[PDB]
Each structure stands twice: as structure tokens, then as C-alpha cells.
Amino acid sequence: PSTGVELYLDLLKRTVSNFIYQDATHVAGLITEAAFVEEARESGEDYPTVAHTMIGMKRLNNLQHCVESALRDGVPGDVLETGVWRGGACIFARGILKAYDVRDRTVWVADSFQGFPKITDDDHPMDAEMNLHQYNEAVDLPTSLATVQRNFSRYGLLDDQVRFLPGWFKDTMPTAPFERLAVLRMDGDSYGATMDVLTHAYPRLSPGGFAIIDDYCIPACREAVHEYRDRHGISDEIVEIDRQGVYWRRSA
Template sequence: MTRLVDSNAVIYDIAAENPNMTDLDRLTNLYWALCSVLRSGIPGDVVELGCNAGHTSALLKMVLEAEGDDRSLHLYDSFDGLPAPSSADRYLKQGDCKATAADVLAVFERWGLKPPHLHEGWFEETLPGQLPERVAFAYLDGDFYESIHTSLTHVWPRLSVGGSVIVDDYCDRELSPRAWDGLPGVKKACDEFFADVPASRRVLVGSGDLAFAEFRKKG
């Protein structure tokens, strides 16, 4: 089976599998963001918080494979859908976006990829004791205010200097006028967390309604 190590065109196939969560804009931005971290030699593992059925996770693993990098990929998900929303959240409800660990493993098997490290449970239960000691790259796709704030609280202290955190659903209409604004709790959580934490922020854009931000850890 064709993989990223053979041709970047496989990104089209991954996007087609689950276009609502793994569209081309997301995948290409993640591809280059992770590549930049790996090629800069930033130490640490790769983590994804909110992996759902693992389609985006497969791309992250393919990038590691294509770059000849053997660092570990850790995936975190409740596998019980979303938690209860806060007053800052809208659009999605408790229990939405449910997938199983078996779904993730099936995606990896279908692409001929080595299984990732799976961590099942709510973020507040798994992250304190199950994150790698050092993180080089993190993809945060928690959808809700509390999930994103909890993710940043635990991931950022372990992020290596120069490391990158990509946050899905971060909508800044001033810098990215097409961005989808359906999950406002995400930006609220990020803005509150980084109010007193030094980081470089870059709002990413795409051809569609991509809502993405990258936060880099300064030295």
C-alpha cells in the first residue's frame, strides 16, 4: 500500500476517509508543522489529544516513518465521546465524536503502520501520569474549553523549547476570515492559558474554513 514514504499524494486518500475531521487543509498543515519540528531536531515524542478514529493519527505516524524518525506516537482519547460542554462551548454535545480504540488500531492496520501508544480515559485522568517526559509536537483536538485548557496545562510544561502545539478549532476571524467559529471555547481556553505564558502564536490558514493555530515554545 502506498504511504507517505512513497508519495505525498497519499494525503488525498487519508482526507477522503473522513473529510469532516481530516480534510486536506488540516493534513497539509500538520504535515509541514511536524516535519519542521523533526527536521529541527527538537527532542521529545509526538502526542495527539483527541484522536477519534485515528485518521489524522495515521498521517502523524506516516510523517515519522517518512522522515526515518523512530520517536513514539502517543494518542489520548476518552473513547466515550465528548464530555459535558461548559458555558463557553456550543455546537457539539456530550457523547458526540465517539470512536473506539479498536477503530484506531484498524486504521493503522489498514495502512500497514505500527500501532501507536493508546491512552484511554478522560484527559484529567490520563495526562498527569501518562504523558511522555518530553514532548516535541502535540496536536490538540479536544473541541471544548475544559478539554483544551486541561491539555495545555499538562502538555506545555513537558514541551521542549522549540516544540510545537497545533490546536484545532482555534478561530481568529481577524487573521483568518474564513475560519469556522463553531467551537469558541477552544480559543477562549488558549487565550486564557497563554495570557501569562510566553509563546509564539501563528494562526494558520487554508483554502476552506480551517481554524488552526500553532504555538511554539520559546527559549
């Protein structure tokens, strides 16, 4: 980092992930100690008590790569994240556009703003077995729209190039009012959330655009990804980011 832009985006990553203050993690799942562990935050493997994103430094770097590549290569369209929690990844995305004075692209912030949904009879058996809803409280997942908006405002990044899509993805995605995406960041964990968004948002991903699957390490998510790719004849290389996330670049 040397230029003002490089310094800003570097600091923004360290700030939204709270490498700066090194907040404790929630203790849930396979995590058994609250201590901040550098390696865990680096790879987005903990559940921050305070930080605005849980995706970690490697997945923030990937998001920067994808947005910057889209700008560099003239890939048209907006940035959408499905599953935003406290908003840190979307805050970073808006910051990237701000750094490069991009005025013609929007960051779409899609979430229930309620955490994971209760399991229903419609759910895939793998989703029903996992029952992600049981973890909502343990990792402070339910985060209101007002809270997320407040978080954007603390960075000076709440403006008309940030638009919110509140509700369940099955309700918000089919008629979401974007025409094209350059980056589609999927971070909803379940077979259902992944299939919802691949079905309803992926067709608007421009060729040359990036599809990021945050939760590929989760069997149910991975199942949706393969079902969807097999259905559509998608063979674009799945590239690992860290121990959780992957992405591909959409070929024409």
C-alpha cells in the same frame, strides 16, 4: 511530489482525508447537504462519513510541516494528538516517522474513545452552553480504541511507536508517560479539553516544538488558549492554518 517519500506522504494525506473516494459528509451543525465539496475537504470543514480524519488537507499539510521541521531542526520529543476520532491524523503522523525511518519517537493517541463528555456542574459556562455531547451521534464521533487500532493496521502502521492513552484528558494527561513532545496537536473543541491539555501536556513541549490548536474558531477553545497564554506569559505568534486551526512555535 517526486521521491518515494514525497509520493508516499502525499498519497497518505489524500487517503486519510479520503480525497481519493470523496465520501459524503454527515449533515449536522451548519452543513445542510451530504455532497462531497472539494473546498470543504481541502480546509477540513466537513464531517466525513468514511474518512479517517476530518482535519482536511491544509491541517494535514500543517502537521507534516511541524513534524518535518522538528526532525530538521533537532527538536526533541514525541507527537501527541488530543482528540483523534478515527485516528487519521495520528496515522499520518506515524507515516511521516515511517517515511524518514525515525525509530526514536512515538505517536501518542489520546481520546476518550467515547466522543464528547456529558456536561457536568464542573464545566465552563461556554462549554455548558455549547453542549458538544449533543452532536456525538450526528457526526459518528464515538469511535472505540479497537476501531482506531484496526484503522492503523489497514495502513500497515500499527506498531510499538504508536501508543494509546484511553480516557478523559483530565485523567490521562497529568501522568501520561512521555517525557518530551516535539508536536502537541490539540483537537478537543471545548474550553475544558483545551485547558486540560495545555495545563498538563504543554509544559513538556520542547522549545522549538509546535502547539497546534485545531478548534481555535470555537469561542470556548479560544477562551482557554488566551487564559493559558496570559497566565504563562506566552507571546509566540499565533499563525492561522485555515478557517479553523492555528498554531504557534514555542520559543525558549
